[PDB]
Write an enzyme that holds these catalytic residues in place. Sequence first.
Site, short mmCIF file in Angstrom:
data_model
loop_
_atom_site.label_atom_id
_atom_site.label_comp_id
_atom_site.label_asym_id
_atom_site.label_seq_id
_atom_site.Cartn_x
_atom_site.Cartn_y
_atom_site.Cartn_z
CB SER A 1 -1.52 6.34 -3.55
OG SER A 1 -0.64 6.76 -4.55
CB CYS B 1 4.92 6.42 3.77
SG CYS B 1 5.70 4.92 4.28
CB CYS C 1 4.16 -7.32 3.91
SG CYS C 1 4.68 -8.24 5.35
N1 LIG Z 1 8.18 3.75 1.39
C1 LIG Z 1 7.19 3.90 0.51
N2 LIG Z 1 6.43 5.05 0.57
C2 LIG Z 1 5.40 5.28 -0.32
N3 LIG Z 1 5.10 4.35 -1.29
C3 LIG Z 1 5.82 3.20 -1.34
C4 LIG Z 1 6.87 2.95 -0.47
N4 LIG Z 1 7.36 1.71 -0.79
C5 LIG Z 1 6.66 1.19 -1.82
N5 LIG Z 1 5.71 2.12 -2.18
C6 LIG Z 1 4.68 1.99 -3.21
O1 LIG Z 1 3.67 1.19 -2.65
C7 LIG Z 1 2.81 0.79 -3.69
C8 LIG Z 1 2.24 -0.58 -3.30
S1 LIG Z 1 1.06 -1.26 -4.49
C9 LIG Z 1 -0.40 -0.29 -3.96
C10 LIG Z 1 -1.51 -0.30 -5.02
C11 LIG Z 1 -2.76 0.50 -4.63
N6 LIG Z 1 -3.48 -0.04 -3.46
C12 LIG Z 1 -3.71 0.55 -5.79
O2 LIG Z 1 -4.88 0.11 -5.68
O3 LIG Z 1 -3.34 1.02 -6.86
C13 LIG Z 1 3.67 0.77 -4.93
O4 LIG Z 1 3.17 1.67 -5.93
C14 LIG Z 1 5.05 1.18 -4.44
O5 LIG Z 1 5.71 2.03 -5.34
#
Ligand SMILES: Nc1ncnc2c1ncn2[C@@H]1O[C@H](CSCC[C@H](N)C(=O)O)[C@@H](O)[C@H]1O
Length: 794
Positions: free
Chosen positions: A344, A389, A424
Amino acid sequence: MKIEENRTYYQKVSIDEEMLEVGDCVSVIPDDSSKPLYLARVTALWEDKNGQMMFHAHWFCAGTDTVLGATSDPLELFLVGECENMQLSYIHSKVKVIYKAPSENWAMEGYFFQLWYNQEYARFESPPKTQPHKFCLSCIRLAELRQKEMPKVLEQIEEVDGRVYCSSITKNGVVYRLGDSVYLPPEAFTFNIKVASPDPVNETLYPEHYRKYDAPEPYRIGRIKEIHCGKKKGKVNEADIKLRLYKFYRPENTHRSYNGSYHTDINMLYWSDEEAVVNFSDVQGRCTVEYGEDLLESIQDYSQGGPDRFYFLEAYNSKTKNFEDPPNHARSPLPKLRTLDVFSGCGGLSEGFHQAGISETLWAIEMWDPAAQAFRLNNPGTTVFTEDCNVLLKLVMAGEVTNSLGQRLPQKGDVEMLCGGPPCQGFSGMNRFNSRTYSKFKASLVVSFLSYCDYYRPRFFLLENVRNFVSYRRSMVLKLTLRCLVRMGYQCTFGVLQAGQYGVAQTRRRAIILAAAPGEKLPLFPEPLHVFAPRACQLSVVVDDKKFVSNITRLSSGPFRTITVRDTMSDLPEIQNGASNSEIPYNGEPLSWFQRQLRGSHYQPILRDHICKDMSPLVAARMRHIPLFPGSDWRDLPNIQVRLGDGVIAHKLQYTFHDVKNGYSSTGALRGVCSCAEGKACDPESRQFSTLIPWCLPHTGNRHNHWAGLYGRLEWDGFFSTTVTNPEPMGKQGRVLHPEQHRVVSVRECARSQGFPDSYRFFGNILDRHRQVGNAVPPPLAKAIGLEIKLCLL
Ligand SMILES: Nc1ncnc2c1ncn2[C@@H]1O[C@H](CSCC[C@H](N)C(=O)O)[C@@H](O)[C@H]1O
Ligand SMILES: [Zn+2]
Ligand SMILES: [Zn+2]
C-alpha cells in the site's frame, strides 16, 4: 443451406472421405516451413459460380504468436479478428478445438481456447457471447468497426451553391450537432492576434562550462456554427464534411500569453467571433463549452462534474485586445468496490481510486511501519496490516480470522478489487531467464501478488510498477505475469502511461497491468489529459520485436496545457537548507489552478512537510554556486576555494591530464582529471577529494552525456524529473535543486510533484517521508485509471 445469387452454400463436404462440418476446426500447412500450422474455424462451406469448392476460415492465433510467446500453453488458442475465404483443397486435417468456459463457480476456484486476443493492444478479453450459415465473429467485428469509424450525415438541411448544409453528423460513435464544440489539432487554424517568434566566460574560473555544448500545444477548440458537405453523383459526399467554427481563445492565446495567464483555470476560455473552416476528418473529439452565467451550478461544480468541460465569461476582441462581455448569440438558446491494496505505501494509488469514486480500500498491507502509519492517517476506515504480504497470506491459509492484534483478515468474497505495486528487485537488465531465475520469479513479490489474485479472485486487478517492468529479463517478467493471469482465466492487458499527461509537472513513466474477471469489461487505458514533452511520452513497448501500444489515441495533443514547476509550487514560502519545521503557515494564497486544486477552497492556513534535507557544508556550498539561469547545473560551478565551517575547505579541482577528445580550453588549460582522459588506464591516485566541482563528474562525463542535470535546478517553466525516494543532487537525475533557493526540494514540493493534496499526511523522519512520496503512484494518474474502471461498472 441457402443459394445466394453467385454462391451455393452447403453444410457439409467430404474431404478424402472424411466429413467436415460447420463448427469444426481445420489445419492448413504453411508454405513457410518455419511457421506453426495454420488453424482455423470453418464458418461456411460453399461453391462459387466459377466451380471452386470453398470454405471461410476464421483463423485462431496460437499462444506463441501472442505477447505470451513461448510461455504460453502449446494447446491454447486465442480468437482473433483474422478470417478469409479459402479453397477446400488446402485443408490438411480436421482438428478438435474445445471452448474452455469459465466455471460458474469461478470465484471459489482459488486444442482449447478461452479468450479473444487483440494483437495491436495486447488485450486478452472474453469472447463475444453473441449468437446467430456463415456466422463469423471476425467478419461481424470488422463490420461493426467500419460502421463505427466512418463519417456519416445524420441530418441534411438545405443545399446552397453545390453544398449541402447539415445539422448533425457522426464519426467514431460521437454525434456532433450545431452548437456543439469540437477538439481540433493545434494547426487546424490560427488566431488573428499576431505572435512574434521569441556570452563568454573565463574557462579557468568555469572549467566545465564547455560541456553545456517543448510540449506541443493543447487542442484548438471551436463551436460549430455550420456543417456543409459536397455532393457526389447527386448524393451527399460524406468523405467531405466540413465545419465552419467560432474560434475559442485559451488565455495564453490572447495577448496575455503564458506570463499573463499563470493564474487562470486550465479549463477557462474566451469567446471570439473569429471563424475557421476545418475538415471533419480533423475533429479529434467533442467537448462541452458553456457560458459561465448560464450554469445551473457553480463553475467548480460544473468543472469537476465531467470530462471535457470548459467555460468562458468574456469575449476577446482580437482587434482592440480588450475583453468585453460575450455577445448574446454566444449563450445557449454507484457502489464502491471493496478494495485490498497490497504494498500500500502511504496510499497514493488508493487515494486516486478514492477520488475516482469507484472504490473503498478496506484493507491495506504495508510491511514498512512509517508508510503503514501514513496510510492509517489518511484512511481511518481501512484495516491496515503492518506486515509482510507473504505472512498475511499464510495466516489466511491457516484459517485464522484475525491476526495476533485483533485485525480482521480479508477472505474470499470480501475482496472485489485488488491493487498494488510489488517491488520487483533482482530482475533488472536483459540476460536470458535461466532455470534458477524461474525459481526466483516463483518466490518473488510479484508472484505473491498474483497469489492474492488467484485466491481472492477479485473483479478487477491492477499491478503498477516502474516502466522497465515491461522489459526486465527480455520482457520475461511481463510475459510470465500475463501468462499467470491468463492461466487463471482473467482478461488482461498491459501498457505504459506517463504521469505528466494526467496533470502533474513531472516526467514519470510507469508500467500498468490491468485484469478483469470473466464476467466484467476489461478497462481501457485513460486518454491523456494534458500535453507533455514528446520525448517523455514514448509509451510503446517492444516484446520479442513486436511493438505493442495501448488503446490511447491522443498521440500529439490534448485538452489541457501542461502543468509546470511554477504551477506546482510558486506559492510556497521560502525555506533554507535543512529546514525542519513540519507545520508552518503558507503566508499567501494559491496562485495557480493546480495549487487551488491541491490546497482546497476551505480556509486552511497550515502548510505541512515543507521541510528539506540538511545537506553537508560541501553540498550546501555547491548549491549556493549553481546560478539561477534556467538549465543551470554542475557544469556552471566555479573552480574556487571556499571556506567551509569548522575550518574545512572546498578545494580547487586540478586538471593535470589531457582530454584527447575535449582538447584545451580557451585559457590554454588542460581538461582531464585522470589518465583515462588520455586513452590510458586510470591512475589509482587520480581521485581528488573535497572539491567544489565533484571530481567524478569530469572523470566520466564523456561517457554519460556530461552528467546533464546533476546539481541541476528545476526550471519554473519545466517539470520535475521522476520523483525519487531520496532526492540527491548527484543521483543520476539530480535536477533536485529549487529554481531559486539554495537547497533541495522539500517533502511537500515532492508531494506536489506527485499531485498529492496538501491535506495528505505522511509519517516518520524526513527520509521516511521522501520515501513515501517517491514510492507513490501520483493520485492524478490513479484517478484517471480509476475512471476507466468506472466505465466498466455501468
Ligand atoms: N513483503 C512486503 N509486504 C508488504 N509490503 C511490502 C513488502 N515489501 C515491500 N513492501 C512495501 O511495498 C511498498 C512499495 S511502493 C508502493 C506505493 C503505493 N502504490 C502508493 O501509491 O503509495 C513500499 O511501501 C514497501 O515498504
Ligand atoms: Zn470472417
Ligand atoms: Zn580514470
